[PDB]
Ligand binder design. Structure first.
Ligand SMILES: O=P(O)(O)C(O)(Cc1cnc2ccccn12)P(=O)(O)O
Ligand SMILES: O=P(O)(O)C(O)(Cc1cnc2ccccn12)P(=O)(O)O
Ligand SMILES: [Mg+2]
Ligand SMILES: [Mg+2]
Ligand SMILES: [Mg+2]
Ligand SMILES: [Mg+2]
Ligand SMILES: [Mg+2]
Ligand SMILES: [Mg+2]
Lengths: 367, 367
């Protein structure tokens, strides 16, 4: 049902944008075609994990103190909240859409969702792809304003949205600057490659992971479900914030691990985090426990497309039982996520349940 | 023809076991009369799909790419193999009768196959029923030793056969302990049913069905077929276990679904599973696609002798469009199962057609 609703509003959103563009922007049907296909391609074919969350949260806070006016329960709020909930859901989805479009270019990925990255479609330049990206972020604003201009929460909605928008970009700077020694970090300064791997620290890792994934993936969807429910003050931001960060860091680590050990047929993307010399969890988790010996062979094999290097990089990781360190991680995270969510239930049992469902879609995660 | 020879070997095996009981174990006619009825009630009625397959695997293999060691198309081996094939089929059919006599008590079911379960029989105490099940499994060994004495494969039949026997109890343990949190599994403290239903994952489902039903339903019949026609090396096992596993998961799922929706009439019993609150395919799939709100009510009702709460479960199953997922489940299996057969059909057509008739009698399961 929720995906039923959710998808109904997708079609609604797509129609407004596309039609707005042609009635008020002077756009030919051709380009509209392009934009219509761009949107579909980058915005559909996913989990709708973030989108679906906002809805579940919304519809879950609905029951308790349903806004509270003068009426003996009215299903006009139930309906007005889950349309809003749906729009916010899509605001999140177009937002990630934008970042993934820009990310693949950046990470130079060649595929995603079993299909080529947007910027790798035969009929798409990268120049156009970079702006298709911008377009996706702008869509989120046209749609928020188009459907929320009469909502008293619009100011708060969009302020929290853009902060998280900003937070994810900070995260991407941390991400993208994790291969070059900070002290050198200087535009005017000739291309410092990725010599020594200091700053490939768990400390350093947690921080890029937090801002680049946790917030737009776990905090933002919950927060936005609160807001369209007018139940934001209803809930402990501290606990909530603590779970999102937790859940959000465990989720990235997962894609970091799935990146190395899951088959692309399952994954979609062809794992290259190695080759890209990415600061993945395996990477930092390895170097902190790897003998002096082990750490050398890593340094000589990491960040390379050589068919015999990566494989060796998959060996040291195997060797070192990184595969085991994960499970331990996974369980610690699991313990605290459950202690945290319990603190929630007390005061916020309605809310606390949709976090659990969110935890349900994360714990599994094998894709 | 197959059912023909099949049914007279039952009378053979039964002729023998009972006389061996009367001549060798000091049994009185009163008890032989008991065991005899015990054997017919619990071993007859069904459709002998397991015990018939083995014979199809046997006839096919004795033909299409048959035994080199066999002579030049002469009716002396046909008798042995097809006979052996029958003995093997009653072994697996006796195997199931054991596991059903025990499961009914465990699962606590009122009828099976249109009749009351064995332990649900007037002069059958629950206490005698447990032993009866035990006997059922001893007979499998007795008939094997008797007929396959000379048989150069006897040790291979029995070893493998016992692997699968061991693989079903394991399965049985998986099923029977998915009602509670694995973390809190310790003989010394009270066993309270889980309220979060965390253990109901597709992945967890998958495993309790692989071991509990695929191996003896789909692999054992096959493998017996091969062994008796001394053709097992000739086939790609890896592909064979794939579809045994494929077809066996599907068969259970089918069971699981029939359990909730098939009329007890067509079905052949009352629908247990919700009351019993097991980890069936439905719950696991509902639970994974349903919302916080939906889940909470399901939670409220599921696993309770009480029609009104049972009807809800049923209600948010189909209103949760669970029959669409099934159909969509069927097709994927049918697709994938349809590729492996021709993968098997390559270096061993003969087996592949026999496997195709087992598929043939699985896809269209209307019983
Ligand atoms: O491409 P993926 O899915 O493998 C990847 O994990 C994507 C990802 C995570 N967080 C962000 C934030 C902005 C843009 C992309 N993001 P990563 O950052 O490793 O490329
Ligand atoms: O009672 P049924 O026939 O519906 C049931 O399907 C019984 C069943 C299936 N597979 C096994 C394996 C061992 C013992 C019993 N088994 P279930 O497991 O659903 O209880
Ligand atoms: Mg990337
Ligand atoms: Mg990246
Ligand atoms: Mg990644
Ligand atoms: Mg059972
Ligand atoms: Mg049962
Ligand atoms: Mg059943």
């Amino acid at each position: 049902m929720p995906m039923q609703m959710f998808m109904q509003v997708y079609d609604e959103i797509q129609m407004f944008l596309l039609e707005e563009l042609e009635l008020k922007f002077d756009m030919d049907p051709n380009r509209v075609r392009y934009l219509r296909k761009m949107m579909d391609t980058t915005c559909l074919g996913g989990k709708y994990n973030r989108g679906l969350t906002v809805i579940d949260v919304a519809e879950s806070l609905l029951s308790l103190s349903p806004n509270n006016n003068g009426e003996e329960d009215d299903g006009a709020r139930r309906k007005r909240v889950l349309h809003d909930a749906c729009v916010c859901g899509w605001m999140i989805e177009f937002l990630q859409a934008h970042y993934l479009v820009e990310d693949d270019i950046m990470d130079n990925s060649v595929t995603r969702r079993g299909k080529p990255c947007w910027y790798r479609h035969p009929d798409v330049t990268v120049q156009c792809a970079i702006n298709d990206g911008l377009l996706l972020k702008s869509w989120t604003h046209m749609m928020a304003m188009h459907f929320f201009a009469d909502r008293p929460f619009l100011q708060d909605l969009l302020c929290r949205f853009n902060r998280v928008d900003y937070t994810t970009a900070v995260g991407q700077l941390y991400d993208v600057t994790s291969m070059f020694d900070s002290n050198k970090l200087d535009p005017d300064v000739s291309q410092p490659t990725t010599t020594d791997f200091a700053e490939f620290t768990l400390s350093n890792y947690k921080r890029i992971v937090k801002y680049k994934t946790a917030y737009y993936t776990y905090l933002l969807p919950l927060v936005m479900g609160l807001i369209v429910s007018e139940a934001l003050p209803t809930v402990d931001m501290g606990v909530t914030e603590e779970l999102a960060m937790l859940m959000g860091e465990y989720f990235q680590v997962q894609d970091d691990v799935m990146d190395c050990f899951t088959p692309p047929e399952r994954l979609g993307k062809v794992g290259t985090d190695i080759q890209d010399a990415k600061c993945s969890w395996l990477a930092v988790t390895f170097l902190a426990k790897a003998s002096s010996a082990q750490v050398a062979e890593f340094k000589a094999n990491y960040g390379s497309g050589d068919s015999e290097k990566v494989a060796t990089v998959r060996r040291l990781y195997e060797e070192a039982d990184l595969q085991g360190d994960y499970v331990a991680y996974e369980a610690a995270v699991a313990e605290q996520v459950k202690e945290l969510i319990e603190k929630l239930r007390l005061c916020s049992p309605g809310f606390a349940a949709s976090v659990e469902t969110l935890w349900g879609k994360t714990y599994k995660r094998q894709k």
